[PDB]
């Protein structure tokens, strides 16, 4: 088996729903980090790229019909380069990284690109075909996030809880208080505001140019103005006996990210800078109704196989779909609610979460943080709608 | 060291015609059919040990939305502890599921996996972009059954947005594939498929969908050369691709088990073939049908296997023009006996996400019947790709 | 300075098709044109460039009936481009409102020769989708226009409710004490009388056929499709109410959802003479009434009382009453309020909408033409046609055979 | 033996401001918008016994959106009128609101009614999209169509025989066939803007208007479409709608707009009973048809029909309110009727190029504004006339009391 190295990595800013990136087609948005990789890495012979693997949760809109291939062509990569799109909802972009890793480790490829995209602003409506002539039963459904075309058998067996309902279920089952959720959310906002001011995100970001030209360069989901008092006043999404609010949850967002992965031979050939070795990826399943706890079996599976303890990681990038689930996962894994190595630059409550891009962001930001801190091993892990988790481990070199 | 990977049991639904026998069956329910059959057929498996379900699906806007692999495993009655992920390389999605499952086991990250694919083209929805302004007068519905929607002007200007049949006409023109040769190939597909269906070959691959649907519906066994000759080309009288020398739009699902040697033992599986490798290739979108050529060359060069060494070649028949052009470029006769011996998608149809899984499982099936050793499955991909996967009977 | 007498002359209609049935393939504008084409063929003395106006009723106007179907239909029918058209909407009463509006135009001296009619293709009624009220709105929705509420105003719901038409008919059954048994008996008489009229060739005298293309050749639709002549009291008794076990309105004691068109000529005495028409009845007058939306089926009562008080005609003086049968509960309630027996011989002698169906815009025109037809066959003198209207109205129109 | 026709009087009249597409009134449902002038008539006329209103006649060209299912009746209920009052909706496209007035007149004249309300509404901002039903299971042929203005669900037989020219295409056809120059069209457009600006500044429109309340609440008080600073240079620079060889521009055409209007009509006996002020007698209405492809010339046969029957010359009118769908057709109509392009009695306060034209509301506006102008000027007879899509015209004559 072959060592696999993450090399350059870059992302767009993350836009708010209907905000700074809402006019940018998903395929064009995916192409932005690909074009930046080309510009940033002039020693690469681009016709040698073996594959572009991209995560995308939707695929009904301008991201239809294999957005990985659409994006590589729009980015100016040669038509000889193949592309494939992966869908594990919020974990899609991490699955692109781990799939790229397995292709190189198994000797099938040498040089690849992995990343992800989502334009939740531009997610379309969908309408099933008529099932009879002159049918009176036509319906439009929003694909921005969550259930559509509900199967009655899925509802009867597993339920079709909304994402916030699942987060309330985790809060109840794992006993995560509203006060702790809000404290976690505030720390995310404070840490993200500090990282933004320090120029940490700027080092990850390439601008999006929109045709005078408008240039989008800053993550705009952040709410640095957040106070505990303001969080406390919010009403829960699902009623007064519940805990999840708009303030202790991520949002729906737009963005894309990409990075290069390479064998040792490809690193040398293409003049790349190897930044981390990929150690491995593991997935896990849980009940849909408590999907937020999905990371726990994934992390345990990966760490047990690699012979690494959770405490051995110098950074943990844990997706913040909801504070209730971030906290429940940390507690289950034996990590403090405010452990210093967890989400040190904040996370999705502040930054937002374009589903397909989010997992690629967690890997690239974990690597970035290992470089800043001089850490060795990093873990990125996230929950998945309909009850999964994904975990991926890297080691700085 | 890398780990050997074995394909074990494999099963599929029949392939239904658009609006036909399977049109009432939701894509998620359809995907669950072969998964439930793998449970029934493999009594020694401890199902909570399955590491992953990988499924191909080209659409994902309809009842196949939000990661159909995971939806399908839950509907099939598999434990909720089992993860799933959905792959999209258009017509090659199901083959990509197989090769992706292979790489996961080969690299030591998994031991027992299911790979498959689904498409319900009958039930593909319409899509409507959001309004870009309040009171927008510019709202539009687009069909997602097959082909371009939400066309990007930059894609059109640089690469074109040729329909799939237009790309097949382009291949016929550029590679000099005559109408007569296309029709001869189509007739052989129908003849061979009708023979295989009479011999019970497809029946050995099929689990019924419950009215019991048990037979592939797309076959036209009555096809004659005279009948094909009369047909008018899709794109006008100067062109060559017709409805008779092209595949169709179809519904179906397929799945198979892959396992390490240790998992084969533990779960009482029957190892049937070793997976040798997978490769992908890119070509100009406008001649997408030629995509298999760089994929096959890449795979064979890496493995050190000549194309002539394969005892079966399962080449997707999206169009006779591209099937023929691919064979000619690879130095294989238009009617070579090892190519599509039981016919192909012209006769059988091609639900996009399921097709590539069908090619792998039917190649293996054919090796078993014939006593052959190495098999190659390969197919073209819209927007200009190819994928190839090689196996070896145990 | 005096008003002018107004005569109804020739009148014709398509058959009435079932939803999704015999006429479902026919665009609403083309369907409206069918009776217009028949009037042209049937009345060859008319100088067609003299027609002052075509008035057509249509309740929907969102589909192929959009943008003034009266004018679309007259052009499709081959009438001169010089002929104006206008479309009226009083829901189920639209076609009757077309007749009365044509009458008022001639009575007031403003016109001499007109066509009045109505159309509905409920099979082909489209879906509607409001515009986005913001960029990237997540709140887009489709709504069926086949029948009943869409784009509900919360202020309408809060003040008057948005009861479905069958719910209003249950409200009438409750408030006016009309039993399930009586509703089903009325429905059975409608079916029996319509089956008898069909067998007698009565409907055939009113109908122009519609030609339809099939794969192997053409067919003609010549018979009303909605009738259920094998209806029995037992069959009706077994049906479940639309709105739950404590209710009374069923699919069997209500009209349906249907397709059809009708049209007729109205003319001054001078126009009858000039154009070689055959005058058949004089129009006496039209009146409208309003009631609570939640009991819309009782709407005919104020309309009939208003018209008859003004004309000085008792309800009992009419030799035919054509009362729309939207629901048996409301047909019965109206008769009871007006002092007419539930089975009075002069009411709906050839059956009504429970048997025949009710394409909204066409229905009111049908009631007028069939009342006149029945007067001619029976030797009767005065006729009354009246019908209820969604959102709480009634309309009534009286005629007298020449 | 018939009795005597009854004289019919227009009494109070009122309108909303006219909003731009997606502009000041875009948030207001058509049914609620229609109710605004009805509520104002109630407030303005306390002598009326409202349960005596025989009918509310309203024009509306669309009827697919919040104006569905007989907007006249919807609006009268929303306005607080008793549930005993009937309502009916008329559709002659851009002439609907005028057809409501004339239909109300005929109902009173023929003795069938005594006290009625006539008006019209359009919310073109909020006009919905429409989608035909599937004709077959798993149909691949589903389509959305905009109902804001103009053709949808095109019939191939209509297209083949008469064409399906857009309204601006018809206006180009009129420019071509009637020889109306781009320069003349632009000059007409400029005079519309100048006259409307002067009228607005003089408080003339304010006398006709009731404000609309908007959720935020704020009020909308003034017509939004006017471009008072319009120059000929700017008009000259505009590109034609239909391509470089044509003449119709956005600057010499009406717009797409939102608004509602209503007025009271009454017999002499009702005027007395309800303490109304009779303001004009209605003399008559006539309609006419022309080729769809040149629909803008529709007013010519309607005006000729009406004036011939009444025995009034076009030159006898003290005001002519001619709808300005397009300058090309406004000019072509005047020329055919022998009236100068800039005749002082024509549109003295400007027209739809400046003010806009919510289809169902526009014809009611023309009638009420013609009456207003007769009062201001001391004139006697007024003519209101308009063109209609798919080839019609409508004309209505009044006489100040
Ligand atoms: C009342 C209404 C809801 C019924 O709709 P529906 O259920 O689709 O009507 P159907 O004709 O399919 O009848 C329903 C069932 O009752 C049965 N039924 C109806 N009339 C029957 C009869 N006379 N004898 C026996 N069975 C009868 C039908 O056969 C059917 O049974 P099925 O489903 O097994 O075939 C619908 O017709 C409606 O909305 N009508 C009101 C229209 C209106 O408001 N305006 C028109 C009057 S102006
Ligand atoms: C003619 C029509 C197609 C134009 O629609 P539109 O293009 O959306 O109109 P706009 O208001 O945007 O005007 C278009 C442009 O011309 C400019 N323009 C219009 N009038 C102008 C003037 N007087 N001075 C300067 N510029 C002017 C606008 O500012 C605008 O510039 P921009 O769009 O680049 O910013 C449309 O108004 C229409 O269909 N009207 C016909 C109505 C009809 O058939 N019936 C109603 C009357 S009965
Ligand atoms: C129903 C499948 C939608 C995917 C698009 C089809 C075109 C692929 O080549
Ligand atoms: C097809 C008709 C649409 C009009 C709405 C019908 C409801 C009337 O009571
Ligand atoms: C909003 C109005 C819809 C009616 C169509 C307008 C076209 C008339 O010429
Ligand atoms: Cl989701
Ligand atoms: Cl995240
Ligand atoms: Cl295939
Ligand atoms: Cl009826
Ligand atoms: Cl106007
Ligand atoms: K994976
Ligand atoms: K519906
Ligand atoms: K098998």
From TrEMBL, chain B:
Annotated EC: 2.3.1.174
Keyword annotations: Acyltransferase, Aromatic hydrocarbons catabolism, Transferase
Enzyme class (EC, first level): transferase
Modified residues (Cysteine sulfenic acid (-SOH)): 380
Domain Thiolase C-terminal: 270-393
Residue ranges of coiled coil: none
Pathway linked to the protein: Aromatic compound metabolism; beta-ketoadipate pathway; acetyl-CoA and succinyl-CoA from 3-oxoadipate: step 2/2
Single GO molecular function: 3-oxoadipyl-CoA thiolase activity
GO process annotations (BP): 3,4-dihydroxybenzoate catabolic process
Pfam family, one: Thiolase_N
SUPFAM superfamilies reported in the protein's UniProt record: Thiolase-like (SSF53901)
Catalytic activity as recorded in UniProt: succinyl-CoA + acetyl-CoA = 3-oxoadipyl-CoA + CoA
Positions contributing to CoA 2 binding: 91, 220, 247, 380
Active site (record annotation): 91, 350, 380
Thiolase N-terminal domain segment(s): 5-261
PROSITE patterns registered for this protein in UniProt: THIOLASE_1, THIOLASE_2, THIOLASE_3
Binding residues for CoA 1: 91, 220, 223, 247, 316
NCBIfam families associated with the record: AcCoA-C-Actrans, pcaF, PRK09050.1
UniProt function note: Catalyzes thiolytic cleavage of beta-ketoadipyl-CoA to succinyl-CoA and acetyl-CoA.
Family matches, as PANTHER family: ACETYL-COA ACETYLTRANSFERASE, CYTOSOLIC (PTHR18919:SF107), ACETYL-COA C-ACYLTRANSFERASE (PTHR18919)
Family: Belongs to the thiolase-like superfamily. Thiolase family.
Name of the protein in its database record: Beta-ketoadipyl-CoA thiolase
Organism: Pseudomonas putida (strain ATCC 47054 / DSM 6125 / CFBP 8728 / NCIMB 11950 / KT2440)
């Amino acid at each position: 088996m072959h060592d696999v190295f993450i090399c350059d990595a870059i992302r767009t800013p993350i836009g708010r729903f209907g905000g700074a990136l809402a006019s940018v087609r998903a395929d064009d948005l995916a192409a932005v980090p690909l074009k930046a990789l080309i510009e940033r890495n002039p020693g690469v012979q681009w016709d040698q790229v073996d594959e572009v693997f991209f995560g995308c949760a939707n695929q009904a809109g301008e991201d239809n019909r294999n957005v990985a291939r659409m994006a590589l062509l729009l980015a100016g990569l040669p038509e000889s380069i193949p592309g494939v799109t992966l869908n594990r909802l919020s974990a899609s972009g991490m699955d692109a990284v781990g799939t790229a890793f397995r292709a190189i480790a198994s000797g099938e490829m040498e040089l690849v690109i992995a990343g992800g995209v989502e334009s939740m602003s531009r997610a379309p409506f969908v309408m099933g075909k008529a099932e009879s002539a002159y049918s009176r039963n036509m319906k439009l459904e929003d694909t921005t996030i969550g259930w559509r075309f509900i199967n009655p058998l899925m509802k009867s067996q597993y339920g079709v809880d909304s994402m916030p309902e699942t987060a309330d279920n985790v809060a109840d089952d794992y006993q995560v208080s509203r006060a702790d959720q809000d404290a976690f959310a505030l720390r995310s906002q404070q840490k993200a505001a500090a990282a933004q001011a320090a120029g940490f995100f700027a080092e990850e970001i390439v601008p999006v140019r929109i045709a005078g030209e408008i240039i989008v360069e800053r993550d705009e989901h952040l709410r640095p103005e957040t106070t505990l008092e303001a969080l406390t006043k919010l009403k829960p999404v699902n009623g007064p006996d519940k805990t999840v609010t708009a303030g202790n949850a991520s949002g729906v967002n737009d963005g894309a990210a990409a990075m290069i992965l390479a064998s040792a031979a490809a690193v040398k050939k293409h003049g790349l800078t190897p930044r981390a070795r990929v150690l491995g990826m593991a997935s896990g399943g849980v009940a849909p109704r408590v999907m937020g706890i999905g990371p726990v079996p994934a992390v345990r599976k990966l760490t047990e196989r690699l012979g690494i303890a959770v405490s051995d990681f110098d950074v943990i990038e844990l997706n913040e779909a909801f504070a209730s689930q971030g906290l429940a996962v940390l507690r289950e894994l034996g990590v403090a609610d405010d452990a210093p190595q967890v989400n040190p630059n904040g996370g999705a409550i502040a930054l937002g979460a374009p589903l397909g891009m989010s997992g690629a962001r967690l890997v690239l930001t974990a690597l970035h943080q290992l470089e800043k801190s001089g850490g060795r091993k990093g873990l990125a892990t996230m929950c998945v709608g309909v009850g999964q988790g994904l975990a991926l481990a890297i080691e700085r070199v």
